[PDB]
Amino acid sequence: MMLYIVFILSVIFVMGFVGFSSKPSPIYGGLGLIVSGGVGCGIVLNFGGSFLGLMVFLIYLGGMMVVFGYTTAMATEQNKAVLGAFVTGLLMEFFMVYYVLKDKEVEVVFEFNGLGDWVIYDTGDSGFFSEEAMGIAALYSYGTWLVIVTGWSLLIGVVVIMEITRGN
Amino acid sequence: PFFDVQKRLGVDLDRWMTIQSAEQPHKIPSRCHAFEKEWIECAHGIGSIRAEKECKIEFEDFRECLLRQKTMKRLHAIRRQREKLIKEGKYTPPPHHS
Amino acid sequence: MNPIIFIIILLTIMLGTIIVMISSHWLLVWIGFEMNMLAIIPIMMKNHNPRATEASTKYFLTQSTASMLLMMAVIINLMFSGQWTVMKLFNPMASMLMTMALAMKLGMAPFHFWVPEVTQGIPLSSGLILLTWQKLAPMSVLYQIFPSINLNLILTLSVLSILIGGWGGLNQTQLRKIMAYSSIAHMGWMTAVLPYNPTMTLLNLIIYIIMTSTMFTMFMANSTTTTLSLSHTWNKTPIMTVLILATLLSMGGLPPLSGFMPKWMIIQEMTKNNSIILPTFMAITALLNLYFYMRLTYSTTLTMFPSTNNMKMKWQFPLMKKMTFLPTMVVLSTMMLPLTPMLSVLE
Amino acid sequence: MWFEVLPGIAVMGVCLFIPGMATARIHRFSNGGKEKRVAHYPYQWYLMERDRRVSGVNRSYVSKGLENID
Amino acid sequence: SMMKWNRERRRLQIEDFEARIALMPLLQAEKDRRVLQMLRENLEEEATVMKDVPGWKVGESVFHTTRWVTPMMGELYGLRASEEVLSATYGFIWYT
Amino acid sequence: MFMINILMLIIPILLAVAFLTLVERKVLGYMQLRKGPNVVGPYGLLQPIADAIKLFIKEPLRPATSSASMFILAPIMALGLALTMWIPLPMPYPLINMNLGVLFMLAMSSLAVYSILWSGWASNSKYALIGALRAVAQTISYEVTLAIILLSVLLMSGSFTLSTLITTQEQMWLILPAWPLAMMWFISTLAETNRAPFDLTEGESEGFNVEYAAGPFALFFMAEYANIIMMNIFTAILFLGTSHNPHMPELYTINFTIKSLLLTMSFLWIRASYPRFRYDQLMHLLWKNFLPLTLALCMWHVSLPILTSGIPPQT
Amino acid sequence: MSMVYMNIMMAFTVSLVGLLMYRSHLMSSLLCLEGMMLSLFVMAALTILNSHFTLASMMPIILLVFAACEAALGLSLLVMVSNTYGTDYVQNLNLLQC
Amino acid sequence: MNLMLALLTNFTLATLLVIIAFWLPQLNVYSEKTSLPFSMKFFLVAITFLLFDLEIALLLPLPWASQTANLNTMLTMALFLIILLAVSLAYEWTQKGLEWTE
Amino acid sequence: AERVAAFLKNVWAKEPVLVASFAIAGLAVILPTLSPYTKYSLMINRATPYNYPVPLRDDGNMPDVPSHPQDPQGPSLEWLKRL
Ligand SMILES: CCCCCCCCCCCCCCCCCC(=O)OC[C@H](COP(=O)([O-])OCC(O)COP(=O)([O-])OC[C@@H](COC(=O)CCCCCCCCCCCCCCCCC)OC(=O)CCCCCCCCCCCCCCCCC)OC(=O)CCCCCCCCCCCCCCCCC
Ligand SMILES: CCCCCCCCCCCCCCCCCC(=O)OC[C@H](COP(=O)([O-])OCC[N+](C)(C)C)OC(=O)CCCCCCCCCCCCCCCCC
């Protein structure tokens, strides 16, 4: 059962998405996006991406969802459609899981497989470095153009946000 | 590109990351590097209209390496038969497989 | 805004479009849209009133939604091809999402609902950037992925755009709503000829941009946003009425004016491909655009509407607005038909 | 007097000493008297798995020297 | 002091990387045999399990090319104990 | 044996927290010409037990909360993350030897800001929520210098592993080449942990946990005091590295523990010496004093190894 | 492709359908927009990490940086709406073509 | 597997203490008791932290980036990013964005 | 110059923190282009073998390529040991 950790995490990932997608109060919707983000980190970790996994925790959850919750606290006042939507999404996920395990194969737009995510992993790895770390670190040797446009857009974000919020 | 500034100026802006067969840090290869090299070399300079039918073998192999659809179906066939011969007590796996 | 900051923001609007147009990598195309949208919001809120806040909010929600569909197309195209190159997409589902993402960014029907309301709620200067410059990047991408665009989908968006834009403008008195619907109608013409000859998409885009720019510039000169405020122009700047007449007839596709050239060349290309019913349907339906262009001519140039006594105070002061390139644009937008075979410079 | 503050400090020190002493002794107890093997990169993991097969027993902290060679 | 010490560490890192380089030929040779052996075992239980299925050929590639294709984890450990499949797949990521 | 290892970590942390309250009350007393707790037990050693029993049998205070589920989530998150920031610490051998241990601690400490935020919502007090927003703003602001300062010290270590900071400092403490960063790092840990002179949450006449009294309030207190020890342990590993002898690991722990206690005591030392900042003044300290200097020292510490040929190893 | 893609790709659909169906709160919709990015982040990371496309490993970080910058603009617009009407309900934004 | 088991213990222990701390008091059976305006400056500090945080994400891989053979390119890009981060601080500073007086 | 010898003293008296910041940032931009040890940094990053040195097939006209790792040909790291 431990060999299907990624798939088990993938179900929790969807269930969290049905949580905040049914659009409960923003306080609880933001709680469902923190859980899904945490489960999203786990899936990336189990594919060999450790730096990418921790970026979600440090930036997506620690930096971006904090601002979403912080903004909700002061810019929001604080149903029978949230419950109906949530029930529909959970049933939709359950049927997919049943048919991807019972038959081991489902077809919705794309053709999926149910053997397990481990069957596609690479069988050869003997380097003395982390492959994703070398790729990410290459942003400074190769991604000169990426850095310039990315850094410029962050600077413009500061300029733009201050224009919008001045109010005069 | 709509405007091919990169080719005119001879400056590489984003072509370094367009394909997975390009130069990588520390010469780390991609899992489908060999297949992509063949498809890109088959369909070089003949256009997409010719390439869509003259390089279909290279692309189908490349598509198989990427998503492994035909590899997984064959394995799934092996496993279904194996389990059908064990619910009917008709197959004993060897010790090195158990 | 501080004048220097205004220029920095415009250069970033232009830089994002240029990044989309010079990019061989799908990620840089997405970054160009993100940068372009980031720097367009501040100029949509330069007046700081509720109607500009709503317009920017509706614009933000539509463009952000389209930007996420565009990313999904790129990742799906990556899963099935393993490459990021800006070219034909290697999956039918990726093509539909990219086409619908670019249709939402352009405002084509049935994703058109934002274009009229966003334009009405922002100043004329920002509406001009919205309806002319913002269509250069989505059309640049469509120019490159058209070999893998579903023919039925793209021609369905075109027909709907021509119909909705034609019918929508009939019920309008606000100029910025009239120009918004005229924009949707012309988007359909650009994308209907895309499968057959994408060089006639550039021709229609260039002529439309010139004509649209001329129109907004003359609305900014007199600070007119309504039909009745534009009908006082004969009693202040009579010359500006004749130029509006000429530019409105050209937008309607009447010969011998420039605005006939796109409609003329698109029909020529579609009939070469044995497409007879569609060009006929589009040409006739475009008479809806001509109708509400002709209404503006009646109330601006061909009749003298009632004036106001305070108007007599305006006769003493000149026009101090820049009206940049207006003499050049109005001539290019009306007198270019004899130079039609010059379109091959776009090849 | 100030030295009457020390008995409280002594308890903190002992409590903070236990986690680091316990980990060191448990690692040596669980790894045949040696430090726990550190595998931060996939090459170090490949060797650890190779020792697990060479061990004869399914434990990578049991080393084989020049006695398995003929 | 940090310059002096970090240069020594880079010299110690080159020594460690060269010890790895001197062993890679030996490790590579045995990895090839282990990979080939596991494929051979799978090709034998496939013949036994798929002798009655009609139209089935034993050992048929899914690729049009005859070039060697590095197998994925689902072809080496297809029919082995899940304990050693888990170690092969998630062992490194989970270690400490 | 691993489950025993976790308990050998969790339990002493809570006992270290328990008797840090005693040590804080005596140290402040002796700097104030007092004696501190010396009646309840000999030298006050039983004072922490009396407080614990008293708090956990006092009447619950919970008033009407709009997000009762959020009321229970905040203490769990605060105390779960406080213990989770200890598992990668090398002392000298970590419980979970992570290759990215430094990033793991930044990531977990950037989630503890939710406990502040959720407790403000679950209090149904518009003046408690304002207090939480101020507390959140201060915390995230000083997380910027912690990451940039930490990134500048790793450019001399060469990796995000916490155990490599031991090797990097085998000849010399990193405080000597990076004392400007240590000064700002140390004050950031004060502001991050909401300790004096940055404890404007305790501006009685000038907190978000008021809706917690006894029980859950005791758990928030343990989480906060557990982070002070962890931050000061992190400071010692980062700027006062201890020599590690593989054959005598306990020698490291004794020396390492003494350093981590002195830094913890200095937090009490500071609390007894200064008045506290206004809210705007501790923001101007970060945005207009620390951030300009931290950015300048990050540029310097990226270029310094390159220009001296002292780039550290990747492994 | 692999049943992990089945759920991540279904996560995107749930967030897309959640975004296109507003209830009352603008903030609730901005969360669905930020849930789509997370689903894209995970989908993009899995494909790159599995295929050993080393240079592409920086792409998910760039996606996170721009979408967070976009989200900051979204909150700013939401804050300006709240100041005007006191609440962030999307039903007050109908002055244009009411 | 150790990390998964380590996180489970810490939050399970925290969960147990929270519940007993809510219920252990509820056995004394005590007598029945029978008894914001938005600030734009708090939002601006939260947004500014986010944009600085996104810049920190780009700077985090610097320790690995210094191991490359293109040091002239890497050092330029590294200093460019940090400098542009300083420009943002300079811009907010000069536009009265860091003030707290209304 | 009273302009440059009086402005500097003013900032050093009113904003000593910013003066230090700009001095530290300035040196971080200038010194790398002037240091004589910057070249060594680049040489050391090149001498770190991360991958296997795949041998070259010997065609009989490659005098400068060693046949055995201990032969006198090929790159040498003597500069590093003496650094
Ligand atoms: C190489 C041989 C050279 C000869 C060639 C023949 C000439 C061809 C010229 C064609 C280009 C025309 C534009 C350039 C001249 C504009 C100069 C100007 O505006 O001031 C005039 C200027 C005014 O003199 P003024 O002593 O100062 O008295 C006025 C006061 O200053 C001020 O007193 P005001 O305030 O009372 O004045 C207000 C206003 C009066 O305002 C009003 O209240 C009247 C409102 C009701 C009038 C409605 C009739 C509007 C007629 C124009 C319709 C436009 C659509 C064109 C459709 C084509 C078929 C017509 O008066 C006007 O200025 C309006 C006339 C100018 C309109 C500009 C039209 C530009 C668009 C033309 C597009 C043409 C497309 C042709 C097809 C393309 C193939 C090439 O006249 C002259 O002094 C000499 C200039 C000679 C040109 C006269 C203008 C005629 C243009 C309209 C006829 C279009 C003919 C098209 C034939 C197509 C077949 C080939
Ligand atoms: C060749 C060399 C090149 C590289 C050189 C790089 C370094 C050069 C030297 C840099 C200068 C040193 C910077 C030090 C940090 C300065 C921060 C600053 O801005 O200060 C001014 C700031 C602000 O000063 P201010 O409030 O007076 O106002 C300054 C600005 N004006 C005047 C315009 C308003 O002061 C503080 O930081 C005080 C914070 C409160 C501290 C309370 C607790 C005190 C605890 C003391 C014990 C600390 C022990 C630390 C050791 C920890 C051990 C682990």
> Structurally, how many domains does chain H consist of?
1
Say yes or no: F133 contacts chain H, CB-CB below 8 A.
yes
Write the CATH number for H43: 1.20.58.1610
What's the number of CA atoms in the CB half-sphere (13 Å) around residue A81?
10
Q: Which of D39, D43, D50 sits opposite E95 (nearest CB)?
A: D39
Q: Is residue H81 part of a domain?
A: yes
Distances from the Cα of F294 to the Cα of F146, F246, H43, H50, angstroms:
9, 36, 24, 17
Q: Among candidates B33, C84, A13, A57, which has minimal Cα distance to G5? A: A13
Q: Is C28 in the pocket of ligand 1 (CB under 6 A)?
A: no
Is residue C149 within 8 A of residue C198, CB to CB? The reply is no
F29-36 long-range CB contacts below 8 Å, 24 or more apart?
F30/D2, F30/D5, F31/F269, F31/F272, F31/F273, F32/F272, F35/D4, F36/D5
Cα(C193)–Cα(C203) distance, rounded to whole angstroms?
A: 11
Burial class (CB in 10 A: 0-12, 13-18, 19+), G46: buried
* CA triple B58-B61-B65, angle to 5 deg: 135
Is residue G80 within 8 A of residue C53, CB to CB? The reply is yes
Chains D and A touch (3+ CB pairs under 8 A): yes
Cα(A165)–Cα(F150) distance, rounded to whole angstroms?
A: 32
- Determine, for residues E14 and I47 on separate chains, whether the beta-carbon distance falls below 8 Å: yes
Q: Measure C220 CA to ligand 1 centroid, in angstroms.
A: 22
Q: Is residue H13 part of a domain?
A: yes
Ligand 2: which residue has its CA nearest to atom 33? I15
Place of tokens 């060009």: C279
Which residues of H lie inside 8 Å of I (Cβ-Cβ)? 67-69, 71-72, 75, 79, 83, 86
Question: Residue ranges of the alpha helices (H) in G1-98?
Answer: 3-20, 26-51, 59-85
Say yes or no: I51 contacts chain B, CB-CB below 8 A.
yes
Say yes or no: E93 contacts chain H, CB-CB below 8 A.
no
SS3 B88: coil
C2-28 burial, b at 16+ Cβ within 10 Å, e below that, comes to eeebeeebeebbebbbbbbbbbbbbbb
Q: Which domains does chain A have, with CATH numbers?
A: 4-162 (1.20.120.1200)
Neighbours of B (≥3 Cβ pairs closer than 8 A)?
A, C, E, G, I
Q: From the alpha carbon of C258, which atom of ligand 1 is closest?
A: 78
- Looking at all shown ligands, the one closest to residue C257's CA atom is 1
Is the previous residue joined to F92 through a cis bond, with omega within 30 degrees of 0?
Answer: yes
H42-63 burial, b at 16+ Cβ within 10 Å, e below that, comes to bbbbbbbbbbbbbbbbbbbbbb
Is residue H25 within 8 A of residue F214, CB to CB? The reply is yes
Q: Among candidates F232, A129, B98, C88, which has minimal Cα distance to E16? A: A129
Cα(A50)–Cα(A52) distance, rounded to whole angstroms?
A: 5
Is residue H32 within 8 A of residue F230, CB to CB? The reply is no
Residue D52's CB is within 10 A of a number of other CB atoms, namely 17
Domain that holds residue H72: 7-94
Q: Among candidates C211, C193, C248, C53, which has minimal Cα distance to C128? A: C211
Q: Is C245 in the pocket of ligand 1 (CB under 6 A)?
A: yes
Cα(E4)–Cα(E10) distance, rounded to whole angstroms?
A: 10
Question: Which two structure tokens, joined as six digits, stand for E88?
Answer: 């092969």
Q: Going by C-beta distance under 8 Å and a sequence separation of 6 or more, which residues neighbour residue F298?
A: F148, F151, F152, H59, H82
Question: Which two structure tokens, joined as six digits, stand for I38?
Answer: 């910057």
- Determine, for residues H57 and G82 on separate chains, whether the beta-carbon distance falls below 8 Å: no
Amino acid in position C188: G
Amino acid in position D31: N
Cα(A73)–Cα(A60) distance, rounded to whole angstroms?
A: 18
What is the per-residue DSSP string for E30-42?
Answer: HHHHHHHHHHHHH
Chain H residue with the nearest C-alpha to that of E95:
H1
Neighbours of C (≥3 Cβ pairs closer than 8 A)?
A, B, G
> Which of D27, D31, D36, D50 should one mutate to test binding to chain E, selecting the residue with the greatest count of E CBs within 10 A?
D50
Is residue F162 within 8 A of residue F90, CB to CB? The reply is yes
Cα(D19)–Cα(D41) distance, rounded to whole angstroms?
A: 27
Q: Going by C-beta distance under 8 Å and a sequence separation of 6 or more, which residues neighbour residue C334?
A: C246, C247, C249, C250, C257, C258
DSSP character for E72?
Answer: B
Is residue G42 within 8 A of residue A40, CB to CB? The reply is yes
Strand partners for A122: E72
Question: Which two structure tokens, joined as six digits, stand for E63?
Answer: 């690729």
- Determine, for residues G38 and A100 on separate chains, whether the beta-carbon distance falls below 8 Å: no
Chain D residue with the nearest C-alpha to that of A130:
D41
Q: Is C336 in the pocket of ligand 1 (CB under 6 A)?
A: no
Q: Going by C-beta distance under 8 Å and a sequence separation of 6 or more, which residues neighbour residue B63?
A: B69, C80
- Determine, for residues D13 and F97 on separate chains, whether the beta-carbon distance falls below 8 Å: no
Chains B and G touch (3+ CB pairs under 8 A): yes
Cα(I10)–Cα(F183) distance, rounded to whole angstroms?
A: 26
Q: Is F212 in the pocket of ligand 2 (CB under 6 A)?
A: no
Q: Measure C229 CA to ligand 1 centroid, in angstroms.
A: 24
> Which of G51, G57, G61 should one mutate to test binding to chain B, selecting the residue with the greatest count of B CBs within 10 A?
G51
Q: Is residue H27 part of a domain?
A: yes
F90-116 burial, b at 16+ Cβ within 10 Å, e below that, comes to bbbbbbbbbbbbbbbbbbbbbbbbbbb
Q: Are strands A107-108 and A110-111 parallel, antiparallel or unpaired?
A: antiparallel
Q: Among candidates C130, C15, C32, which has minimal Cα distance to C86? A: C32
Is residue F144 within 8 A of residue H52, CB to CB? The reply is yes
Q: Is C233 in the pocket of ligand 1 (CB under 6 A)?
A: no
Mutate to test the pocket of ligand 1, among C239, C249, C254 (most ligand atoms within 8 A of CB): C239
Q: Which domains does chain G have, with CATH numbers?
A: 3-85 (1.10.287.3510)
Question: Obtained via which technique?
Answer: cryo-EM
Strand partners for G25: G89
What is the per-residue DSSP string for C187-199?
Answer: HHHHHHSTTT-TH
Is residue E27 within 8 A of residue D45, CB to CB? The reply is no
* CA triple F290-F291-F293, angle to 5 deg: 65
Q: Among candidates C81, C100, C82, C99, which has minimal Cα distance to C90? A: C81
Q: Among candidates H62, G7, C227, B54, which has minimal Cα distance to A96? A: G7
Burial class (CB in 10 A: 0-12, 13-18, 19+), F256: buried
Q: Measure C318 CA to ligand 1 centroid, in angstroms.
A: 21
Cα(F206)–Cα(F196) distance, rounded to whole angstroms?
A: 14
Question: Residue ranges of the alpha helices (H) in F177-271?
Answer: 179-193, 216-239, 249-271
Is residue G33 within 8 A of residue G85, CB to CB? The reply is no
Cα–chain-centroid distance for residue H80?
Answer: 24
Residue C206's CB is within 10 A of a number of other CB atoms, namely 15
Cα(I22)–Cα(I24) distance, rounded to whole angstroms?
A: 5
Residue B98's CB is within 10 A of a number of other CB atoms, namely 9
Cα(G62)–Cα(A108) distance, rounded to whole angstroms?
A: 30
Residue I9's CB is within 10 A of a number of other CB atoms, namely 10
Contacts of B83 in chain E (CB under 8 A): none
Q: Is F287 in the pocket of ligand 2 (CB under 6 A)?
A: no
Q: Among candidates F249, F255, F215, which has minimal Cα distance to F237? A: F255
Q: Is residue H101 part of a domain?
A: no
Q: Is F196 in the pocket of ligand 2 (CB under 6 A)?
A: no
SS3 C269: helix
Phi-psi region of A120 (alpha: psi -120 to 50; beta: other; left: phi over 0): alpha
Contacts of B73 in chain A (CB under 8 A): 113
Phi/psi at G18 (5° precision):
-65, -35
For chain B, what is the HEC assignment?
CCCCHHHHHCCCCCHHHCECCCCCHHHCCCCCHHHHHHHHHHCCCCHHHHHHHHCHHHHHHHHHHHHCHHHHHHHHHHHHHHHHCCCCCCCCCCHHHC
Q: Among candidates A8, A20, A135, which has minimal Cα distance to A85? A: A20
Amino acid in position C106: L
Q: Resolution in Å, one decimal, please.
A: 2.6
Q: Going by C-beta distance under 8 Å and a sequence separation of 6 or more, which residues neighbour residue F198?
A: F138, F190, F191, F276, F277, F282
Chains F and B touch (3+ CB pairs under 8 A): no
Q: Is residue H34 part of a domain?
A: yes
Q: How far is C18 from chain B (nearest CA, A)?
A: 9
Q: Is residue H74 part of a domain?
A: yes
Cα(H69)–Cα(I43) distance, rounded to whole angstroms?
A: 8
SS3 E18: helix
Q: Measure C242 CA to ligand 1 centroid, in angstroms.
A: 8
Ligand 1: which residue has its CA nearest to atom 43? C238
- Determine, for residues H57 and G72 on separate chains, whether the beta-carbon distance falls below 8 Å: no
Amino acid in position F76: I
Question: Which two structure tokens, joined as six digits, stand for E58?
Answer: 């034993």
Q: Is residue H24 part of a domain?
A: yes
Mutate to test the pocket of ligand 1, among C236, C237, C242 (most ligand atoms within 8 A of CB): C242
Gyration radius of chain A over CA positions: 20
Is the previous residue joined to C110 through a cis bond, with omega within 30 degrees of 0?
Answer: yes
Q: Is F239 in the pocket of ligand 2 (CB under 6 A)?
A: yes
Contacts of F158 in chain I (CB under 8 A): none
Amino acid in position F207: G
Q: Measure F183 CA to ligand 2 centroid, in angstroms.
A: 7
